[PDB]
Amino acid sequence: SGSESKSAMMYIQELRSGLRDMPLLSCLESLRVSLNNNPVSWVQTFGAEGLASLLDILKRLHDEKEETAGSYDSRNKHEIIRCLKAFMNNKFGIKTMLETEEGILLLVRAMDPAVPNMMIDAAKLLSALCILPQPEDMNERVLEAMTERAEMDEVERFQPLLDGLKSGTTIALKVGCLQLINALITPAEELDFRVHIRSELMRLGLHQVLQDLREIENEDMRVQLNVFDEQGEEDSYDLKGRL
């Protein structure tokens, strides 16, 4: 039953206290379970207040590179992404996330193949936002956030995406990337845009990764290639138009 305990109220205070490494991790793990297992009204109490405090820490940890910092920091970022997954698992949580300046950007920055499990979780959240039949064709805004991430981390906006798809990485990471690639392309009605994204990825060597990935007997990889190739086939005839 309910009892006096860490409410959303206490987690907000705790996150804003300036915790780091293992006690931060412990707070976040506890918070993720709490967000996932409590009613949406508990998430509402947490909503603007807790989300801001998660992002405050997340942004800092993205700039604080774990190779030159704490071994826990990589896991701390990842656990924030898991907290966000539980937070965005609803109505008003999705809403509050789209009302943040950097929430979308930080989810893209969390797509790092060096911490492969975090990229899997982050790419999934972005993909879920991309396919939304709501707001604004949110997939189109997610692309902007990668363009921002491109200059902030000095990379090509789609370089980390391809880098999941990696013979020599886990299948879930590989695909975590193909999935978001499909999520960016498919919801857009503009044909020239769909082929532009597809061609942009092909410049980055994507064409070479697909041939490696089609040899894999996987579940979801097969599902994602099949979609990518099918939309590619339609788009080719769509561009051709009449003859």
Partner: peptide
């Protein structure tokens, strides 16, 4: 308490059911 909303989107992505979105513009007539 539709706390599951993102979970359903993950299903839709994995099955590829969501990549079945096109309002359908065309110029060929």
């Amino acid at each position: 308490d539709e706390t599951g909303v993102l979970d359903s989107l993950l299903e839709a992505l994995q099955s590829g059911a969501a990549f079945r979105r096109k309002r359908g513009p065309r110029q060929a007539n």
